[PDB]
Amino acid sequence: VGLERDIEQFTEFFENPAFRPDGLKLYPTLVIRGTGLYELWKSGRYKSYSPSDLVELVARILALVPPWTRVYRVQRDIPMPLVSSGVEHGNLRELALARMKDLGIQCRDVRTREVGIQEIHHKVRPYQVELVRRDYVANGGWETFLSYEDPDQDILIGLLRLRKCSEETFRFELGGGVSIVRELHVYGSVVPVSSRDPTKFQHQGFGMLLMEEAERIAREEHGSGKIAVISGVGTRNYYRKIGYRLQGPYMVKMLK
Amino acid sequence: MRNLKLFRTLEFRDIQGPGNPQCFSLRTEQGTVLIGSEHGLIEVDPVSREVKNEVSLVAEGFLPEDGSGRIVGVQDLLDQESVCVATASGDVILCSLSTQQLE
Amino acid sequence: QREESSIPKTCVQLWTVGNYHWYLKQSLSFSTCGKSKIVSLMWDPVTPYRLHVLCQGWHYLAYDWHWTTDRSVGDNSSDLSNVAVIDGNRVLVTVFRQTVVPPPMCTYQLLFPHPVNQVTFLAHPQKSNDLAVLDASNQISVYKCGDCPSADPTVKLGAVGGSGFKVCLRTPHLEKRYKIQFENNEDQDVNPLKLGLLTWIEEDVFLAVSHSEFSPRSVIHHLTAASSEMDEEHGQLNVSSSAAVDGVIISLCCNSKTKSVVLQLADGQIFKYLWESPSLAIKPWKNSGGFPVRFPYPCTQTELAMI
Numbered sequence A: 001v002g003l004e005r006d007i008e009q010f011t012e013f014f015e016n017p018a019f020r021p022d023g024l025k026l027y028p029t030l031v032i033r034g035t036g037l038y039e040l041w042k043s044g045r046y047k048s049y050s051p052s053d054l055v056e057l058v059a060r061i062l063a064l065v066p067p068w069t070r071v072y073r074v075q076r077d078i079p080m081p082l083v084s085s086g087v088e089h090g091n092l093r094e095l096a097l098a099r100m101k102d103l104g105i106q107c108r109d110v111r112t113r114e115v116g117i118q119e120i121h122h123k124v125r126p127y128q129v130e131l132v133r134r135d136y137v138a139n140g141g142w143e144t145f146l147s148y149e150d151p152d153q154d155i156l157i158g159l160l161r162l163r164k165c166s167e168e169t170f171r172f173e174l175g176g177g178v179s180i181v182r183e184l185h186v187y188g189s190v191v192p193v194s195s196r197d198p199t200k201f202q203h204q205g206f207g208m209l210l211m212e213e214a215e216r217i218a219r220e221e222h223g224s225g226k227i228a229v230i231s232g233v234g235t236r237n238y239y240r241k242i243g244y245r246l247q248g249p250y251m252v253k254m255l256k
Numbered sequence B: 001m002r003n004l005k006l007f008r009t010l011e012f013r014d015i016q017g018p019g020n021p022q023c024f025s026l027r028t029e030q031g032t033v034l035i036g037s038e039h040g041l042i043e044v045d046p047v048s049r050e051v052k053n054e055v056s057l058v059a060e061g062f063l064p065e066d067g068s069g070r071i072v073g074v075q076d077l078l079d080q081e082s083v084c085v086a087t088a089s090g091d092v093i094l095c096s097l098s099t100q101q102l103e
Numbered sequence C: 001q002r003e004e005s006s007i008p009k010t011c012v013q014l015w016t017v018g019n020y021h022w023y024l025k026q027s028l029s030f031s032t033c034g035k036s037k038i039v040s041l042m043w044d045p046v047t048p049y050r051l052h053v054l055c056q057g058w059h060y061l062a063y064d065w066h067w068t069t070d071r072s073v074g075d076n077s078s079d080l081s082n083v084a085v086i087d088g089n090r091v092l093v094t095v096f097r098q099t100v101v102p103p104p105m106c107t108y109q110l111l112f113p114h115p116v117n118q119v120t121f122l123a124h125p126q127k128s129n130d131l132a133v134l135d136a137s138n139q140i141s142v143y144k145c146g147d148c149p150s151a152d153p154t155v156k157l158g159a160v161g162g163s164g165f166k167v168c169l170r171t172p173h174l175e176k177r178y179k180i181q182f183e184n185n186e187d188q189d190v191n192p193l194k195l196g197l198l199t200w201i202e203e204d205v206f207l208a209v210s211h212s213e214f215s216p217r218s219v220i221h222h223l224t225a226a227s228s229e230m231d232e233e234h235g236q237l238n239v240s241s242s243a244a245v246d247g248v249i250i251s252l253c254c255n256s257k258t259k260s261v262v263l264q265l266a267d268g269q270i271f272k273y274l275w276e277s278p279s280l281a282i283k284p285w286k287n288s289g290g291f292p293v294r295f296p297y298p299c300t301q302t303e304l305a306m307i
């Protein structure tokens, strides 16, 4: 895979409906002793990129990520002395961000747009919060992505993901007209349960606003007659508070 | 999404020339078409319904007159005023405009 | 020509791509034997949307396209924001006032026996949800909204259907399949696209623009529906008028509230066309100062507003 197939690879990754994921982990290839790639490298048949080319490629790749995708990590964490060739530095992400600032392009993923990261890396706070909705098609399904965010400063606060079940669902609880919620999240610092902090963002009612809108799309637009949520356990108690009941491993509610 | 809509069409019927057309090429900066045939070259302006030049490649022994021979390719050259035709029998003639010169 | 008596045909198709989905946008038909045979094709190397065609009988053609979106405009209490997209022999309709559907999918779907070339909406303030479709066989189909859908087999549901899903919306139904007759019977032209800028201005009146081939001239037609009585299905659209204009017409626009029709020529001059008058006169368009209006450059999108 040369230097030109990578750009096409990632462009297809983010433009082809069969591939669009929810999160990404970028792991540039490292050659380590005791593997077949090590034998290939010794025989003079495989050579890595130059560091400038690698930084340029990572900047170009990060410029393509859609606003509904979150990047969790950018390189491996193998100690430097054990690597025979490949990446040698330890802060590829910030070097790539500086290069992107030089080129004039910007990164717009989820991680680098939330309140905590924008608060510790820069010094900004939301002022003019608004509601945003994005729809698309992925993996044969109709996906929606609801969010509360500040447009002028590009700051994210809370998000929710919704999907209409396709015609090839096998679970018994989701057959017959069910729409499923896949994630609900509000960022900031941690606020302990039943506590409140007016200088943080969690316990201020951004969650019941995001669920009321999800319950309106699933009834007037999807045409469904039931809504289901996948959740943990504390979330089980939360959704019981909202008005959902338990069925199997899901929290369900009638919409009729 | 969006879709295409046709908003203009231009048609120039009943061009008259030596034989049957075989190839054509465009002159962008001037807005003129170069048509090749079984005898020579024609240069025609479609927005004014007129022919501007004509060069015969049969009188100078480059193409047979019995009815055989083709011009495989006709190409305009920018930064010049000459047209490079290519005979099927195999030759690279470099014709010129504003005159009747060949090379 | 596998059959001994079969008459071969030539087709030129224009395709584009979306979300990795390949649409079929345009289809042109040409003959294969005689003066109409095609010798060569070529895209213009500078202008993106110009096509050059050279036939056998010393014949030359040039075609110009541009991108556009088909949407409906009407009163607040009645109109639903509609968008129509062409996908070959199907038309995909998304109703945006009730459902917001990603582009590859749609609210509902109309099926046709021939590839579609033009799609348009009605220009009535209280009936702006009707549809008209013109396909490659030169017939116009009309789809109207009524209290009873009539359950015609040519209308299907898209992403708002399935087993167990139910949403309340009004779908249209077929009403006529008109046929266009020209002045007597003639070989027409090797050009297969003679009617352009089709505009549905009243529940029985269409306007179309035709281009000449000798002088730089244009013609405006009046397609009106005529029937002795409700004899059967189908119908006949008789060309009932023809107006001549010097210059090349490149855009036609209408206002559904004030009922004004505006023409743009190839140099920039704007004209007003009166169709309800018995004189069918054409006038220049005046500004506040009483002077004629000319666009400095040829615009590709035009609209009429009330400032």
Ligand SMILES: CC(=O)SCCNC(=O)CCNC(=O)[C@H](O)C(C)(C)COP(=O)(O)OP(=O)(O)OC[C@H]1O[C@@H](n2cnc3c(N)ncnc32)[C@H](O)[C@@H]1OP(=O)(O)O
Pocket (backbone or CB within 6 Å): A182, A183, A184, A185, A186, A187, A193, A194, A195, A202, A203, A204, A205, A206, A207, A208, A209, A230, A231, A232, A234, A235, A237, A238
């Ligand atoms: C279901 C899933 O997949 S996970 C949800 C995301 N996981 C997380 O906990 C990370 C961050 N999550 C959050 O921000 C919240 O826990 C959410 C998303 C569940 C709700 O977000 P918020 O905007 O904070 O909720 P909102 O302000 O509307 O509700 C506050 C109430 O929820 C309660 N609550 C919050 N989390 C929980 C929980 N895990 N269990 C029980 N009650 C909870 C609070 O105690 C408060 O109740 P009270 O003030 O009446 O006593």
Ligand SMILES: C[C@H]1O[C@@H](n2cnc3c(N)ncnc32)[C@H](O)[C@@H]1O
Pocket (backbone or CB within 6 Å): A027, A028, A029, A030, A031, A032, A076
């Ligand atoms: C745990 C993840 O580590 C990544 N991974 C595995 N081997 C290597 C390597 N030599 N270099 C870089 N990344 C690697 C793979 O993507 C695997 O899924």
